[PDB]
Amino acid sequence: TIYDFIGIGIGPFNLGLACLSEPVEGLNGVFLDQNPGFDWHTGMMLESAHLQTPFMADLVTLADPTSPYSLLNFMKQKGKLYSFYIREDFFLMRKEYNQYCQWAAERLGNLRWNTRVEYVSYDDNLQCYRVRSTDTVSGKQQEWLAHRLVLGTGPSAWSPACSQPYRERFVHSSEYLLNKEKLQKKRSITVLGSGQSAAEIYYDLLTDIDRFGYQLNWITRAPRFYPLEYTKLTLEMTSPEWIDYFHSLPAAKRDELNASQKNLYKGINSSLINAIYDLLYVKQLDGKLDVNLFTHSELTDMRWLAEGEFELKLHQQEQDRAYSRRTEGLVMATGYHYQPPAFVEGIQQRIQWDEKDRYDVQRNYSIDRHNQVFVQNAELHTHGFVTPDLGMACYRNSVLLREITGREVYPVERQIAFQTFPAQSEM
Amino acid sequence: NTIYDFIGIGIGPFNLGLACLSEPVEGLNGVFLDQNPGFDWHTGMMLESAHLQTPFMADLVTLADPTSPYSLLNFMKQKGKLYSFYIREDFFLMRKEYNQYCQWAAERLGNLRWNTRVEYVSYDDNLQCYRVRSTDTVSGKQQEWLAHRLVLGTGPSAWSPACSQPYRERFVHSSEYLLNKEKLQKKRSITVLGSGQSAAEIYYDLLTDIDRFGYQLNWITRAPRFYPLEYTKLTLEMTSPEWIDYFHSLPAAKRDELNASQKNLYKGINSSLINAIYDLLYVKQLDGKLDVNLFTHSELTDMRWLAEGEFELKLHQQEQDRAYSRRTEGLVMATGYHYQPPAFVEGIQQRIQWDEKDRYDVQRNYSIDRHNQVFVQNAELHTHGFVTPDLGMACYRNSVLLREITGREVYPVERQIAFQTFPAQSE
Amino acid sequence: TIYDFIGIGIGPFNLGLACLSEPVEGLNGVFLDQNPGFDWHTGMMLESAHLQTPFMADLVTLADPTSPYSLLNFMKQKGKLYSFYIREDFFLMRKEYNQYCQWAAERLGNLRWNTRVEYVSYDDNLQCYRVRSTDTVSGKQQEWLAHRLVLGTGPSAWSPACSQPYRERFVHSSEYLLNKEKLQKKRSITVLGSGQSAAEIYYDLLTDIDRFGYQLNWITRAPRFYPLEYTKLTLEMTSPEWIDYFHSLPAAKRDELNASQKNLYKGINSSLINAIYDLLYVKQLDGKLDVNLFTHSELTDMRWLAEGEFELKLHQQEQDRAYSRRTEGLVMATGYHYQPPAFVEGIQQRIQWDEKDRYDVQRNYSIDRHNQVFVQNAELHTHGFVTPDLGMACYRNSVLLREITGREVYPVERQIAFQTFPAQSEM
Amino acid sequence: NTIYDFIGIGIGPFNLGLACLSEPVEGLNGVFLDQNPGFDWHTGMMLESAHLQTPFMADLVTLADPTSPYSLLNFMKQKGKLYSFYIREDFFLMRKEYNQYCQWAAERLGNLRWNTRVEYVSYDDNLQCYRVRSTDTVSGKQQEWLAHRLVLGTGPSAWSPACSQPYRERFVHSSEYLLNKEKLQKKRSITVLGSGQSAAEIYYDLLTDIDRFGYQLNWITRAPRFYPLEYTKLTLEMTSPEWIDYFHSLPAAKRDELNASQKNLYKGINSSLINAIYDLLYVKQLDGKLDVNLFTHSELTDMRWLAEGEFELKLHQQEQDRAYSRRTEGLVMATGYHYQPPAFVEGIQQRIQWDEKDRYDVQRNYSIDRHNQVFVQNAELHTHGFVTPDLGMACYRNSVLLREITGREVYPVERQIAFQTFPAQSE
Ligand SMILES: Cc1cc2nc3c(=O)[nH]c(=O)nc-3n(C[C@H](O)[C@H](O)[C@H](O)COP(=O)(O)OP(=O)(O)OC[C@H]3O[C@@H](n4cnc5c(N)ncnc54)[C@H](O)[C@@H]3O)c2cc1C
Ligand SMILES: Cc1cc2nc3c(=O)[nH]c(=O)nc-3n(C[C@H](O)[C@H](O)[C@H](O)COP(=O)(O)OP(=O)(O)OC[C@H]3O[C@@H](n4cnc5c(N)ncnc54)[C@H](O)[C@@H]3O)c2cc1C
Ligand SMILES: Cc1cc2nc3c(=O)[nH]c(=O)nc-3n(C[C@H](O)[C@H](O)[C@H](O)COP(=O)(O)OP(=O)(O)OC[C@H]3O[C@@H](n4cnc5c(N)ncnc54)[C@H](O)[C@@H]3O)c2cc1C
Ligand SMILES: Cc1cc2nc3c(=O)[nH]c(=O)nc-3n(C[C@H](O)[C@H](O)[C@H](O)COP(=O)(O)OP(=O)(O)OC[C@H]3O[C@@H](n4cnc5c(N)ncnc54)[C@H](O)[C@@H]3O)c2cc1C
Ligand SMILES: NC(=O)c1ccc[n+]([C@@H]2O[C@H](COP(=O)([O-])OP(=O)(O)OC[C@H]3O[C@@H](n4cnc5c(N)ncnc54)[C@H](OP(=O)(O)O)[C@@H]3O)[C@@H](O)[C@H]2O)c1
Ligand SMILES: NC(=O)c1ccc[n+]([C@@H]2O[C@H](COP(=O)([O-])OP(=O)(O)OC[C@H]3O[C@@H](n4cnc5c(N)ncnc54)[C@H](OP(=O)(O)O)[C@@H]3O)[C@@H](O)[C@H]2O)c1
Description:
The structure is a homotetramer of 427-residue chains.
Chain A: E1 2-7, H1 12-21, E2 29-32, H2 71-77, H3 81-87, H4 94-107, E3 111-112, E4 115-123, E5 128-135, E6 141-151, E7 156-157, E8 171-172, H5 180-184, E9 188-192, H6 196-207, E10 215-219, H7 232-235, H8 240-248, H9 251-260, H10 262-265, H11 270-284, E11 291-294, E12 297-304, E13 310-316, E14 321-327, E15 329-332, E16 336-337, H12 345-348, E17 373-375, H13 380-383, H14 393-404
Parallel strand pairs in A: 1-2, 1-6, 2-3, 6-17, 8-15, 9-10, 9-15, 10-11
Antiparallel strand pairs in A: 4-5, 5-6, 7-16, 12-13, 13-14
Helix pairs in contact in A: 1-14, 6-11
PDB class: biosynthetic protein
Keywords: siderophore biosynthesis, cadaverine monooxygenase, NADP(H), FAD, biosynthetic protein
Assembly: tetrameric
């Protein structure tokens, strides 16, 4: 009836945690999630889309390579590992990541699907957390009791403030695939934003720009179509060492950095930029292309015209000028935002909050005052750019398991980098 | 005393693998013997820069069982450095690290007996099992081991063309290179004979220092071209169970005019290195003509050591059907390795099937005997082709060995890999 | 009225020769061709197809980088060189090569289109060649007199002997693009052969294998889907040095080699093999693919069935078995064959012939007995695998111009390779 | 005597370019003066392995005129080696070859005067032209040159932080490195200060030999990361006339908080090298912990030379706002180059427009004067941005210089390049 911990969302981070926590003698854990199964970014799962991270950043390998949930074992189980060996590609197709997480989810015993947690509270008598769910299929109430909670509810698709009207006219990157036909039949399309999502889509639509007749535009507030910096000395910043350093900085300094370091976690894989460019070059060989590409351009307002068009007021923040552009179809590749879910109100008072009323996460990813309520991927403001990285999932899950059980279930490296991040006098 | 299910004689990579795959198999009682005091693998051609030509998934166990604790990835984890390796992002291990990894695996195993020279092996009719006579090399103690089955991975040995036996005191085989590098760099002139990978790693190493010491640096080989090892992915399907079960459709040794015909599938230099070699000649040449020669299609038929203080190499340019001669003080004979049955095998001579040439006439499941109990690792260049020296096909073979030794599939064996169909097949 | 030389075809080789010969003081040359303009392999000109050779193997640069016909100048003239610089890709799209040769052809003054030469003779009185043309548009006869002739009439699309019936049912690689729609609407397609043409098409059709419903088969007589060997030490074989060596071999030995060295000039760009494999892997993620891929399989016969199908009798030459396969659509990527054109009869007697009744080409590409009748790309049997290489076009054109004018108009390197090809004794 | 249309003072690459582009222009009478006895370009940071970060098309002339005989490709042809370079297939020239190429261009030009130190420059009111006073360095002879216009490409000079002036006798700037390599490798400890490309080429060079000599090898820089130079193709559009004519929309020096903000577009290390550096640390570490440190975000504020026999470096970790100190025997100060106006320019001080800081307030066509007749090469880091030190934008500038010097477009100037639109623009 009582669990050592209850894990509240089931995305890749909690799924990881589940695969890691299943084999631990003396640990009862359970993971709730409101959907019927694992399905991860179904709407940006393009046929030629792959992860930004090598396959060793699967569910378990960075913490335990021997785990049967490893992507390589997965491959062995489907009798295709030898083909994966021949492929010799560190980067899984997103479709395969998904098929693999699904496999892991079927195999696990600790997951409870179709279970929407509606409310969470602290019972002062019992000294434990009380989690109220609703079966999404049947209505049934349940309560789940646990000493510790970990939240990986995920963040949520975000569109600019000035577009909550018109929402039914545009498509947010996340829904791109469902609406891809509806878009290609328009005569002009525009993608708004410069993240990897934005780029994969822009590439997708370019592939067919002379199959259909469209104009393909790309506008963003970002100064450049920048690459995710992936050179090996910078990849050391993704390390326990660096997280310590970053966590220990002043809280303004962190937020300051997180907006200044967007090229460490938000940019476009550099092969794709180049592929896009090479494709514009190839397409141009037939005749001039109807493409427009703008930079430094914030969407300040939009409006819907009579004939069946948008008019996008933008503002060029570097040369301080405003301007107007129009487009039949629109793809809002503006990314995602966390917001503490509804249920958190019930424990809301027991969670520590910072000046901006966000979780005041501690180095061990705890938000309560007693190391029982943890978060996954709500720490961008407090642990830095490494927070959403599937390749630091095992590391977090390992510091979690160390807090939840008393002990270092999975060894957690203290430093792996050749460089030294903070100031350190010699002697 | 007790009769082992199998004994493995020789702890090369192939038996070291079979050891790690054997260890945790329930009711398998087997043991591995080797002379050497621990694991080492050709420490005298192992240059700072060298590395394996296969991805790291062709480690001791992973292509049969990714969950094994003897996996490379796990070694890396246990050593404290998997994040660094994740940053490295390189399918190819440095030969020195493969070496440390194997040593760590061997130190962790329990089924290996080091310092155990095998002197003689016989079949004990009266007991109906094999009798293996060993010397403990550190005590001197003789000892006898009983086994129903033997798996021999003794490994091949350093080889030079017949015509060179008299000068073996002076020329240095590739295995002896690092130990004489300093010696050879003092000569006026060095020549590197043979155009496999060993030769090229060396030729590159020496070219590096050519502007710095005297020398003339020559490269001569019998081969037609300095050909690359064919690494295109359609062709690696031929290193697969399907292609090996295809190769088991008897041309009864017209598979042997195939084995010299399919030269560039298992011999041949790494593409990168060939190009590296070229780019280096280019860079050195920016300072002057390079005293280099590079010949090709040339069999070394005779050799002599002039009173002058130089070799004279008699070469036969085989395509032009024309003979020539060249000279050289230093001489690195990069002509490979060849398998001869060890001493201890006279003891079961009459028990072993022989090929018309006194090669083990290896059966399809790797047995040399009549009753499926004496097996061999990589003495089948003639029976299984270009694929017998590949660390990638190690787990496949060890898996079929354990099906035979055990009677049951222990590690499944992926036959659903190749897109190609290899045999004729009708519709 | 009289020309120093008349150039009979206008493909890339004679077009090159034309750009090179135009600026030479004291040289009157003229190039006839029966089509209305330059259009080069229109039917294999896929959108993502590019040359196998870097852009410095354009019309002129390997002989004169300062020529205004250089691909880079071309780029400058269209005001897009800075974009070509950003692209940083040595390999022109085939579409761009074409647009560029067309540009060069407009610019030239020495080309005569719509002129089919029907007959050629030696006038014994005049001591010169007499070339009879027909204007393809208007019927008009003309005669052109020249001292020397050079023939770059091109080779011709070839299909296996056993298919001259059925010719109207299949598509030869050369016509692929016109018939691409007609093929994609079939339910099964097969490509016959393993050259670069075969591969580009197989890739093309795979891109859409789940857009349409087809089965995509690939069958070839070749042992493997082999790569064109492009490693830099082998690329030295494409050199004056090597051609000397090769030309000087016995004529059986050459033919022998030309069939043994098909991987030097006939194979698939290795990126494409791998791309094809990666695409089979990606496509397979959705469900098993209806693809079949056969090797060592000669098409011995074919026949057309009632319902609307082919039945291809093949013969697996390695395991000596015949078999039968069927396919609605068929793409015959069997390449091309030279045959001396009709007009050569008129000079036929003055040309030297070899044992097999092919031009007995001399080192300077002459076929007459007096160094006045030259060929371009009819020397495979006598100059080797480098014959069709656009990157040796400038070299040939340069030895031609040296013979035609008295003198070395464009310097012709005697050796550029670090290695030495023939036997060469030291002293 | 005669008054030149322009005189160029300093024969760096930029004026060497303008020389080659100027030479064949009809009715342009101009000449170039330099002290040095011939061309050399920083011979003491030029390591066997170094190479340019730009493709070879950014040679002296090709981006303005591919037909020029001063093109690299033509140099390669004239030297007898273009086939080798075609085999090399490498957009990036070795720094030693760029050097030989420029020297060959300069030896072939007629408009350069070497050994011609320019002592003083004045405006002769009475003649209405500029007066340039020179010393012939080999005769001693004073001499005076007249010119309507001056183009100054004197080049910047080696720079160290202010706080180091006292120890300049002991530490070695990157320019002096090869000459003290042997000296520095004898020390216990070496430190490399600065994280541009120079630093990295050096840091790599030294790491190479780290296992071989004593040393501790440190790397410290002010920069936040060891960032790569941004080479993604969408971003190289910003190095283009369009982006430079965009940059000519006055923020009147808010383009100066851009110039430190756009650090990684023109400073920053080659991607490959960063990774190379990492892979080498990895390989060396296979033998032991490496005595290396690498610090970042650290301004060198003070420095001192202890009696002990060591420097003590006072560093300020700027992000952590914390001071520290480190020590080192050897010290390579890889801190770059800075432009100060030369001596001879006092002579036209009142004639030159100055930026509020005594920098030439460079006008849009590169003029420093009021009457469009004194021009400058690469003293505009503030007026034209990240693009002023790029050999790729050399031909662009020399082309606009020759429009001004000449009144007519001599070499067109490609403004139809970028797919991006850079300024705001409405629809
Ligand atoms: C499109 C995209 C692609 C990415 N690709 C990469 C990559 O290649 N490499 C990399 O390192 N990082 C990547 N990231 C970063 C990261 O994976 C995601 O931002 C995101 O965090 C997905 O993981 P998650 O576990 O946090 O959340 P989710 O996948 O959102 O998991 C949360 C789940 O819980 C559910 N839920 C919410 N509330 C409740 C409730 N009360 N009860 C029950 N269930 C609930 C949700 O609907 C969902 O099923 C990517 C991100 C996105 C958005
Ligand atoms: C240097 C080298 C590098 C290679 N790299 C690659 C690669 O990157 N990729 C690839 O696919 N293939 C590679 N190969 C091919 C293949 O790995 C080898 O040729 C060899 O077959 C592998 O070793 P083994 O297990 O057969 O035995 P070995 O490595 O030769 O070792 C076997 C042991 O047998 C012992 N022994 C002999 N007699 C006795 C006795 N009487 N008693 C006890 N012990 C005895 C020896 O002391 C030795 O330790 C490589 C081969 C070599 C030689
Ligand atoms: C599809 C294809 C792709 C290739 N790609 C590459 C590559 O990327 N790189 C490379 O190095 N090599 C390549 N090659 C090799 C080579 O370019 C071709 O095989 C072929 O030789 C084209 O050049 P050509 O000048 O010989 O002939 P063609 O292009 O055939 O030129 C001959 C012309 O003369 C005409 N003609 C014939 N008879 C007469 C007559 N009596 N009167 C007037 N005109 C006549 C023809 O119809 C034609 O216009 C390729 C070859 C093919 C077939
Ligand atoms: C080492 C180095 C490598 C670089 N590599 C690249 C690269 O790969 N890609 C890229 O895009 N950018 C590169 N740059 C950036 C740029 O090329 C340089 O910083 C510099 O501006 C180029 O030289 P310059 O033509 O300005 O003059 P310099 O190279 O400095 O030479 C100019 C000459 O001025 C002479 N001089 C000075 N005073 C007098 C006088 N009174 N009389 C006569 N002569 C005088 C000097 O003797 C010298 O010969 C590099 C820069 C340096 C310094
Ligand atoms: N591996 C994969 O296959 C994959 C695929 C998709 C996504 N992802 C990941 O998911 C996360 C988010 O990716 P994403 O592309 O969805 O989102 P993102 O990187 O947050 O995209 C935000 C983009 O939208 C722009 N934007 C926001 N508001 C705007 C406005 N008003 N006007 C104009 N532009 C505006 C942003 O500019 P600013 O930069 O100024 O905000 C930025 O360029 C990252 O962790 C990323 O790596 C990964
Ligand atoms: N750069 C480019 O974009 C490009 C594109 C297309 C072509 N090309 C060039 O054009 C030339 C020819 O190219 P290609 O692909 O058109 O022709 P090719 O290389 O001559 O193709 C012949 C292929 O067809 C097979 N074949 C012939 N007869 C057969 C039979 N009866 N049964 C089964 N298979 C049979 C051949 O096998 P065998 O090997 O046993 O003969 C071979 O695999 C080359 O110089 C090539 O590089 C270049």
